[PDB]
Amino acid sequence: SVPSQKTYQGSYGFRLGFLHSGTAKSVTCTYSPALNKLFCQLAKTCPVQLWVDSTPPPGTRVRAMAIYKQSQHMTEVVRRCPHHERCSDSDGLAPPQHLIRVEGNLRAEYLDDRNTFRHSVVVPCEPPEVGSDCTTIHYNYMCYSSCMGGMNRRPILTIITLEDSSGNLLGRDSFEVRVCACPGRDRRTEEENLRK
Ligand SMILES: CCCCOc1cc(C(=O)O)c(O)c(I)c1-n1cccc1
Ligand SMILES: [Zn+2]
């Protein structure tokens, strides 16, 4: 099977937001609205904003999962490559096979789905800090898009789902991800290709 990627704001008006980081050579994470694509360095902080129009109930959670973007690869589980799964870079909570980690949240839970074998990471919803209008989750991607025996140059999507306490769908959004050494240059190149 394949997880749905259909954008769905749902009853709470759920959607993502991204910072405006630019495309300088030194940038470690940058989002392209024209491509709906995040470009980031390996294991660096990727701030993703969560926005709602109304407050979801206590017990609502936010889950992240990666799938391959190309249809001919969509049924294959996205996982870390044979090198990175063995490099003992554990944070003490994320299984070493998981591509996506949540940084700085001791309530993050990592799931290996017993039926689909897909990986995901889920956190409880928390209200914005006083003075803020949205909540941010900090993600890390733990392999390069190019890693041999893993993503192997195949593009991926991240699907972010807002879920109730039982895991039922409340909202969904998604974005493509490229994990690469020079996200600013790659964003500029791909946006130029799109303009041409
Ligand atoms: C108590 C559990 C539910 C609390 O979740 C939110 C509340 C508000 C609010 O304004 O009360 C909000 O703005 C956001 I963004 C979230 N939220 C959504 C996903 C992650 C956090
Ligand atoms: Zn790797």
From Swiss-Prot:
| Annotated effect of mutating G149E | In a sporadic cancer; somatic mutation
Question: Mutating Y31C: what's the consequence?
Answer: In a familial cancer not matching LFS; germline mutation and in sporadic cancers; somatic mutation
Task: Tell me what effect the entry lists for H84Q.
Answer: In sporadic cancers; somatic mutation
Query: What effect on the protein does mutating H138Y have, as reported in its record?
Result: In sporadic cancers; somatic mutation
Name of the molecule in the record: Cellular tumor antigen p53
Q: What is the effect of changing D53G?
A: In a sporadic cancer; somatic mutation
Q: Where is this region: Required for interaction with ZNF385A?
A: 5-196
What effect is documented for mutating R187G?
In LFS; germline mutation and in sporadic cancers; somatic mutation
Q: What is the effect of changing V179G?
A: In sporadic cancers; somatic mutation
User: Impact of changing D112Y on the protein?
Assistant: In a sporadic cancer; somatic mutation
Q: Which residues bind DNA?
A: 7-196
Q: What results from changing V77D?
A: In sporadic cancers; somatic mutation
The annotated consequence of I160T reads: In sporadic cancers; somatic mutation
Tell me what the record says results from I100N. Answer: In sporadic cancers; somatic mutation
Q: What is the effect of changing V48E?
A: In sporadic cancers; somatic mutation
Q: What is the effect of changing R63S?
A: In sporadic cancers; somatic mutation
- Summarize the impact of M142R: In sporadic cancers; somatic mutation
Coiled coil (residue ranges) = none
Originating gene: TP53
The annotated consequence of L111F reads: In a sporadic cancer; somatic mutation
Q: Covered range within the whole protein?
A: 96 to 291 of 393
Mutagenesis or variant effect for M65V: In sporadic cancers; somatic mutation
Mutagenesis or variant effect for H84Y? In LFS; germline mutation and in sporadic cancers; somatic mutation
Outcome when changing T161I = In a brain tumor with no family history; germline mutation and in sporadic cancers; somatic mutation
Effect caused by changing R153L? In sporadic cancers; somatic mutation
Q: What effect is documented for mutating P56A?
A: In sporadic cancers; somatic mutation
Q: What does the UniProt entry list as the effect of changing S4F?
A: In sporadic cancers; somatic mutation
